[PDB]
Paper text:
We obtained an icosahedral reconstruction at a resolution of 4.1 Å from 32,721 particles, which, complemented by a 3.5 Å structure of the penton-vertex region through sub-particle classification and refinement, allowed us to build an ab initio atomic model for the viral capsid, including 16 copies of MCPs, 16 copies of SCPs, 5 copies of the triplex monomer proteins (Tri1) and 10 copies of triplex dimer proteins (Tri2). As observed in other herpesviruses, the EBV MCPs are extensively interconnected through three types of interactions between the floor regions of MCPs. The type 1 interaction is an intracapsomer β-augmentation between two neighboring MCPs within a hexon or penton capsomer. The type 2 interaction is an intercapsomer and quasiequivalent interaction between two pairs of α-helices from the dimerization domains of MCPs across local 2-fold axes. The type 3 interaction is built upon and further strengthens the type 1 interaction. Each of the EBV SCPs binds the tops of two adjacent MCPs both in a hexon and in the penton. The triplexes, heterotrimers of one Tri1 molecule and two Tri2 conformers (Tri2A and Tri2B), plug the large holes on the capsid floor. The triplex is then anchored to the capsid by the N-anchor of Tri1 that traverses the capsid floor, extends along the capsid inner surface and folds into a tripod of helices. There are five types of triplexes, Ta to Te, located at local 3-fold axes. The triplexes Tb to Te adopt a similar structure, whereas the Ta has a unique conformation with its N-anchor rotated ~120° counterclockwise compared to the others.
Author numbering:
A (entry chain 5): 9 to 65, 83 to 139, 150 to 238, 256 to 363
B (entry chain S): 1037 to 1148, 1174 to 1381
C (entry chain T): 347 to 395
D (entry chain 6): 1 to 159, 172 to 301
E (entry chain S): 51 to 344, 364 to 395
F (entry chain x): 28 to 50
G (entry chain 7): 1 to 32, 38 to 191, 200 to 227, 237 to 301
H (entry chain T): 1185 to 1234
Write the structure that this text describes.
């Protein structure tokens, strides 16, 4: 028990300071304790960083988590932690199982019917259960309504293993932290072959937080998912992708028929979160037993998913 | 290869990385060193963003100049010193001709990354009868030299006469009014090109070297006193900068990390680079340095004078 | 520190008896480089230096 | 979270500049960075709004929505201090602005570039040769009309126009500065609006024309005053058809998503939610919405 | 079939000190500090310049005193040191097992290499801002070759003397820029040319200055005062000990000025010198236990330019630890 | 102002043995 | 911090008022503290016409608040900030299910006044709550109420082109993710339908002024019936037309964005409660 | 290497590549095939020296 | 004189002081 | 030479660094046979190189 | 580039006056070698470097 008491003494918010305006001599020791607390919470010593750990419970927030129940067959347990999951909208009232999609499983959902292909078909070799997992794929990308049935739930932080009825826990809104009571920081792993840095495409105001954007689009080959990184705002990044979508307006010019309203709409974009713009993105390599692909590694993620705003 | 009716005064700037030597006397300044103090900025749940802050107050004791800096030796000419011109179809993209069929054709016949900077050069139209003797020394690219620091300080009206009034002759050439009329008067073709009051539709990011010799505010910034106009030079004014390391010279948006100073904005004069009129006077210059002909019958050659004596090697004929 | 890392970096190089070997020493100011040539070794083997 | 940048000046502030800065304390100022110490060279809207070029306020809208925002608390000799604005923090902002727009409605305000003239908010430092310009703060119903006047002078430059130039506010009428050519990004925004109109001119329903016909001939509203009892023949020639429900509903679904696109296209500049605006102190406790 | 680990090594951090480097000859570190506390950054000097009593009756030779006000430069330096909270969590916890004791000592060393990063950040930040002051008040040598010579000035700044001073700036910018380049192109004028240019710099700088005192920064060999300091890069430092050849002292200055910061400037890095980081965290752990139960040599080469023994020093080594521009 | 560059050592209080206000 | 806002109730409630408050405890409520203008009920009174646009503009203007306890003399509610999260409940008599929808709209209730109200008989006021509903349901009911207004006006003027029963067949019910909801549709909402009507009949001349602003490329894609128009118009009436055009288009476009768009992460169908943060 | 007869002699006195465009090997970029090949074989852009 | 003005200005009274 | 590494190894530094390579090849290659071009200044030239 | 010549004439005068010679004649031309190895060229006894 004594370890539990000595640990719960450490995790303990400090008592608030007192002012005794009523008595006179107690005000002296009150302001003396005040200057004693200030001078060792300001000066360069270890007592300064000691006061940074009490956290004063607008600065820190505990994040929320998304608890979902899937099948283990649609999931690959060999993946790294910060994998951006895509929940699918289920039409049944009491379903309980929801169609989540890692970007590798999303890639084999994309290409089946039409390296990321090698890694995706090496982790998710079977396409039958996952094309079966959605109710319909070809008509739902034909009517261009697939975007509103795909919702992002942010990166995975803790996956409890299961033979069947797998449960994933993902940070949907807020600062992405691991779930284990020994603390760790979850690095968001996004594959590079669907990633781009938009400032590498543009070729100057230093921002606070550079966001991470996902833009599912309806390409004439099929579905294409792109993980956009930018320095700008939501109403800004839709204009930046309006400048970027230069062959898309040509394709929209290509379809003479206006009554077919499928080909007038070209995908939607979603703001997934806000990471550290200073501590920028790193390129990393998530390995499998067959290959190793370059994976964009983002640290210190603050997630807040936006809606699918249509281009 | 047929001569047009006009001539040019092609002007570029040339950067040079100079290893410098700074000197300062003892007890030049008094300094109050404040105690360093810490402040948290962004209390991240992962990793808190600290800040270690400092204050120091430095007072200049010496009433004279108790510190100087010399440019000791050149390291590397970072620029091209080249031929790549400015493209006004990039500078003023808003103006075009009447027919579009002639506009795209003109843009076809002209221009619409394996070297250093490319030293984007400006072009000033001049008449052909400008004598070459003006063009061989430290001069200004327009007609009238800027002896405006010589005038009285904080007086714009008398200073405007010595820069734009050609009723009085020039400061150097007392027998003529200007080497060229199409760039030196108040509203000339050279004045509507690089001044402030007619570059309203310009793209702000690119840099033109001729702004130091045509922008009226920085011509009239040197109107003030010499104890102010040598104070403002080493005060990191950066009124006429260019970029440090890109492909094309851009004007920096108040860049403080690059260390630079511009005597071609200070004393407002341009130096003549090594030119000629044929390869023959070029090969005649390298063969005989002392007895070269600066003037041939129709041709000419302007020997370069510069702060840096740039050594030339053509084969093995090397001049200094 | 560095001095406390001195017996750790010097694993066994300090604890060795030292014999004089032959070489020619140039003094290039503060450095004292040792010039030597091995072509007398490579010409016992009839092999190119 | 001590969010307190100290923008140090290069040179000593003069006394008239000290009084000019201290007259304007608590006004909105944009920063270039968010780091712990910045410089005056890089402060404010003056790097994108210069006296050299055309006033292009749409790129200033985009710079404002991109860059971080701040309010001014301390101006001393040789230094001025700014306080950053983060989401989740409530700040006091005083209405010390020369175009007097009173925030009596206490709605969402809008940070706007000084379209109303540089000269009232060109606040001058001759310590260093820099021209800080304060962005104007105004409510949303005046923000939508100044943005539509900016987008309308570019289309009505070719073809009275004092009503187009000057703003229409219930208390006063201030004249704003209108450039003749908008610039690159204003013309890009008007070109995006032009392509939106040329595409969605055929994605309009046909029962609304029967509505405007029957309401101009039958029951004249106050809102039908714009036609002055006039109908073109285009209304009849898209009223030559029969009205349906399914294709009209599908056209309406893509219409709602396209007018959402129009809404977020016109939503330029940061929007701040007011809370308990004090008229007597002239300040408003606001957080960034 | 093993894999060997032949060793893992780390670099020591060289503790620069502004009062150890030779750039503090140019700046006195005083014990007043009222001007930072003072609101106005100015200070008003009552100087007194002599004048020659005229012999003729041209004008009365009046007295002269100048009231000059000098505004101070208040600079703010600020770095950051991101430190992860999962080290703070084991900072606050008390350890009892050698695995967590090793993790605790590792996180204390991580914090002790963050406060030492802060001290080594502001110490290089201080010297950087000092260098950036001395590049803000230094007009170049091609101006002070003439303007610091009273042969042109002090007859009245008319139109004409400025009109000739500009044209004489134009000559020293041409014949006398890049002076160490011409010394290479010159033959047996190696040594005395660079001595000429350095002594002309010393004559152009060292003049009338208010707020004087005792002979600060004496050397060790002769004991003379050091007149100035020459901040240079490493290439010109390696050259200018060969064009000159010999140095006056054996790279030692002996300043007894560094006496009021041996107590004041050492106890600021000693409190983060890992003897005190562990000590303060042991004291905080004792409070957590209490809770639930209730003078010197200076490395600087001294050259001799006639009478004034200035110093030379290159800070390129300091700026190269940072991998930043000089 | 005339206090733009000067230090000050002390003050002169006008007969106020327990007051800090006044001239 | 403190965020517990008390509404100054001058009058003590009776027991049926406690029942009618405890039925709808988990829902949200707007704000302006006073008790007369505490909610959206001042628009749904008999004082003003039940107009839509001013109601939405007030709702986007006014802050919101979720209430956790109800007493007989104090209305305890916590206001909304973009900082932290709150737990909200769908306790509207028009019921809608939040089965995993991460988006929530706060639209004015066009399901009728009695369907979304709490009538206080002893008190001075008759309060209502605004409709909290998922955003595809929100845009769908916007479409099916807007076209119901337009298609009802067209059959009041001349029913020889449209039919009330046929538009009520398709526009009587929305269907999203299986849950098949009903639209109780019976004036109300005439300002928005008139705004949309005059705006879509004013867009052709606006698009032609736009294509004459800056050629045959973007002029091809309008249809041949929407292309032919006579270009003879004075500058004054056309200037006013384009000004009021982009005015009411900005009003319309900001209207079709549904106000402060709430977002949810995990909806418990057992407890009818989800974690909700402002977005 | 066959070249035309109007090649200038000023080119063949300086240390260049025997073909026309001086092949910028590292001077182009690092690890792409559109900038290196664009600056090496596409003559729409003029070369590095001239 | 209530302050610490000794080492800023110097030791001598004929050249400097207060 | 650290001055050419003061800035980062950008795109444009990798051009004049190649030019400095070719300059050092044209001038300072074969440092010993050109030491024999002078007879007096051999020792200081070789000590410098 | 290597030590070319368009004629024996321009290479028989270059060996005489290695400084003020004509690098380009009317139709002929001579191109001096600039190689990193400075080759001793001997034509008769007119030795150039």
């Amino acid at each position: 028990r004594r370890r539990l008491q000595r640990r719960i003494a450490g995790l303990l918010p400090p008592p608030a300071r007192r002012l005794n305006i009523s008595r006179g001599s107690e005000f002296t020791r009150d302001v003396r304790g005040l200057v004693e607390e200030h001078a060792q919470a300001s000066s360069l010593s270890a007592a300064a960083v000691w006061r940074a750990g009490l956290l004063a419970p607008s600065g820190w927030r505990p994040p929320v988590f998304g608890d979902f129940l899937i099948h283990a067959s649609s999931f690959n347990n060999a993946e790294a932690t910060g994998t951006p999951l895509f929940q699918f909208k289920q039409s049944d009232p009491f379903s309980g199982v929801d169609a989540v999609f890692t970007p590798l499983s999303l890639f084999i959902l994309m290409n089946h019917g039409r390296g990321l292909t090698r890694m995706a078909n090496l982790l998710y070799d079977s396409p039958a259960t996952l094309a079966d997992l959605v109710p319909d794929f070809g008509r739902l990308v034909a009517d261009r309504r697939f975007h509103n049935f795909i919702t992002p739930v942010g990166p995975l932080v803790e996956n409890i293993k299961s033979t069947y009825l797998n449960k994933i826990t993902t940070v949907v809104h807020g600062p992405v932290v691991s779930k284990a009571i020994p603390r760790s920081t979850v690095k968001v792993t996004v594959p590079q072959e669907a990633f781009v840095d938009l400032d590498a495409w543009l070729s100057q105001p230093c921002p606070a937080d550079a966001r991470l954007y996902v833009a599912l689009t309806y390409e004439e080959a099929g579905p294409r998912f792109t993980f956009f990184q930018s320095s700008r705002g939501h109403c800004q990044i839709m204009n930046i992708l309006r400048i970027y979508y230069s062959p898309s307006i040509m394709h929209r010019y290509a379809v003479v028929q206006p009554l077919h309203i499928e080909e007038l709409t070209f995908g939607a974009v979603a703001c997934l979160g806000t990471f550290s713009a200073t501590d920028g993105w790193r390129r990393s390599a998530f390995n499998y037993r067959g290959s190793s692909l370059p994976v964009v590694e983002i640290d210190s993620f603050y997630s807040n998913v936006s809606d699918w705003e249509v281009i | 290869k047929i001569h047009p009716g006009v001539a040019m005064t092609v002007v570029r700037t040339d950067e040079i990385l100079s290893e410098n030597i700074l000197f300062s006397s003892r007890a030049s300044t008094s300094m109050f060193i404040g105690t360093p103090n810490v402040s948290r900025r962004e209390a991240r749940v992962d990793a808190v963003t600290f800040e270690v802050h400092h204050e120091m107050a430095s007072i200049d004791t010496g009433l004279s100049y108790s510190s100087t800096m010399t440019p000791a030796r050149v390291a590397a000419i970072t620029t091209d010193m080249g031929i790549h011109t400015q493209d006004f179809f990039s500078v003023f993209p808003a103006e075009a001709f009447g027919n579009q069929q002639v506009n795209d054709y003109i843009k076809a016949k002209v221009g619409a990354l394996c070297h250093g900077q490319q030293a984007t050069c400006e072009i000033i139209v001049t008449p052909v009868t400008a004598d070459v003797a003006y063009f061989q020394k430290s001069n200004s690219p327009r007609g009238r030299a800027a002896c405006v620091v010589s005038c009285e300080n904080y007086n714009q009206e008398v200073a405007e006469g010595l820069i734009y009034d050609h009723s009085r002759p020039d400061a150097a050439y007392e027998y003529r009014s200007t080497v060229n009329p199409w760039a030196s008067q108040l509203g000339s073709l050279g004045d509507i090109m690089y001044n402030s009051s007619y570059r309203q539709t310009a793209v702000p990011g690119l840099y033109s070297p001729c702004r130091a010799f045509f922008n009226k505010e920085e011509l009239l910034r040197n109107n003030r006193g010499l104890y102010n106009m040598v104070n403002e030079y080493s005060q990191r004014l950066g009124g006429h900068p260019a970029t440090s390391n890109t492909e094309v010279q851009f004007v920096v948006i108040a860049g403080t990390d690059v260390f630079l100073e511009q005597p071609c904005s200070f004393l407002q004069e341009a130096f003549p680079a090594l030119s000629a009129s044929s390869r023959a006077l070029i090969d005649e210059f390298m063969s005989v340095k002392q007895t070269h002909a600066p003037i041939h019958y129709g041709h000419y050659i302007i020997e370069e004078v510069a702060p840096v004596r740039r050594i030339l090697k053509f084969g093995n004929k090397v001049v200094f | 520190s560095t001095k406390s890392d001195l017996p750790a970096v010097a694993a066994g190089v300090e604890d060795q008896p030292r014999v004089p070997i032959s070489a020619a020493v140039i003094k290039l100011g503060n450095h004292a480089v040792a010039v030597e040539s091995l072509q007398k070794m490579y010409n016992d083997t009839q092999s190119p230096y | 979270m001590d969010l307190k940048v100290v923008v140090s000046l290069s040179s000593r502030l003069y006394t008239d500049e000290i009084a000019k800065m201290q007259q304007r304390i608590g006004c909105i100022l944009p920063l270039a960075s968010t780091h712990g110490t910045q410089n005056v060279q890089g402060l404010g809207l003056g790097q994108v709004y210069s006296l050299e070029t055309v006033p292009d306020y749409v790129s200033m809208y985009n710079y404002l929505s991109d860059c971080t925002l701040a309010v001014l608390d301390e101006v001393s000799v040789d230094s001025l201090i700014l306080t950053k604005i983060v989401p989740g923090q409530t700040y006091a902002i005083k209405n010390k602005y020369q175009p007097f727009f009173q925030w009596h409605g206490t709605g969402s305000l809008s940070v706007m570039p000084p379209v109303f003239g540089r000269e009232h908010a060109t606040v001058k430092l001759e310590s260093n040769d820099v021209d800080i310009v304060f962005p104007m703060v105004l409510p949303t119903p005046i923000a939508e009309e100044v943005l539509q006047k900016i987008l309308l002078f570019n289309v009505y430059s070719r073809v009275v126009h004092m009503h187009l130039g000057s703003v229409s506010y219930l208390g006063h009428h201030y004249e704003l500065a209108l450039p003749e050519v908008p610039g690159p990004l204003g013309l890009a925004l008007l070109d995006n609006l032009s392509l939106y109109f040329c595409i969605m001119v055929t994605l309009l329903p046909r029962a609304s024309m029967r509505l405007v016909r029957g309401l101009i001939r039958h029951e004249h509203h106050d809102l039908l005053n714009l036609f002055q009892e006039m109908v073109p023949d285009e209304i009849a020639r898209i009223d030559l058809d029969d009205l349906s429900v399914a294709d009209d509903l599908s056209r309406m679904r893509v219409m709602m998503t396209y007018l959402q696109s129009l809404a977020s296209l016109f939503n330029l500049g940061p929007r701040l939610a007011t809370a308990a605006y004090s008229q007597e102190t002239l300040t408003a406790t606001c957080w960034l919405r | 079939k093993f894999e060997v680990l032949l060793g893992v090594y780390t670099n020591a951090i060289q503790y620069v000190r502004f009062l150890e480097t030779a750039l503090a000859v140019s700046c006195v570190n005083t014990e007043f500090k009222d001007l930072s506390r003072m609101t106005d950054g100015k200070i008003q000097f009552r100087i007194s310049v002599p004048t020659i009593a005229h012999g003729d009756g041209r004008r009365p030779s009046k007295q002269r005193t100048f009231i000059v006000v000098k505004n101070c430069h208040k600079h703010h330096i600020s770095t950051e040191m991101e430190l992860s909270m999962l080290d703070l969590e084991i900072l606050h916890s008390i350890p009892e097992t050698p695995v967590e004791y090793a993790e605790y000592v590792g996180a204390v060393k991580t914090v002790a290499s963050a406060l030492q990063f802060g001290v080594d950040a502001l110490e290089r930040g201080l010297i950087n801002t000092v260098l950036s002051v001395k590049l803000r008040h230094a007009p170049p040598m091609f101006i002070l070759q003439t303007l610091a010579d009273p042969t042109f000035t002090e007859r009245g700044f008319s139109k004409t003397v400025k009109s000739d001073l500009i044209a004489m700036f134009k000559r020293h910018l041409l014949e006398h820029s890049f002076f160490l380049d011409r010394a290479e192109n010159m033959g047996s004028g190696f040594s005395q040319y660079v001595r000429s240019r350095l002594s002309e710099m010393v004559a152009a700088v060292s003049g009338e200055s208010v707020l004087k005192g005792v002979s600060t920064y004496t050397t060790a060999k002769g004991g003379e005062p050091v007149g100035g300091v020459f901040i240079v890069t490493d290439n010109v430092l390696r050259q200018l000990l060969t064009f000159l050849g010999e140095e006056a002292d054996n790279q030692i200055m002996g300043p007894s000025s560094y006496a009021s910061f041996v107590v004041r400037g050492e106890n600021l890095v000693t409190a983060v010198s890992y003897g005190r980081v562990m000590r303060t965290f042991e004291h905080f752990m004792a409070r957590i236990v209490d809770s639930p139960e209730k003078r010197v040599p200076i490395s600087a080469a001294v050259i001799k330019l006639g009478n004034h023994a200035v110093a030379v020093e290159s800070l390129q080594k300091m700026y190269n630890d940072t991998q930043s521009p000089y | 102002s005339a206090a733009e560059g000067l230090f000050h050592s002390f003050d002169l209080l006008v007969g106020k043995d327990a007051r800090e206000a006044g001239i």
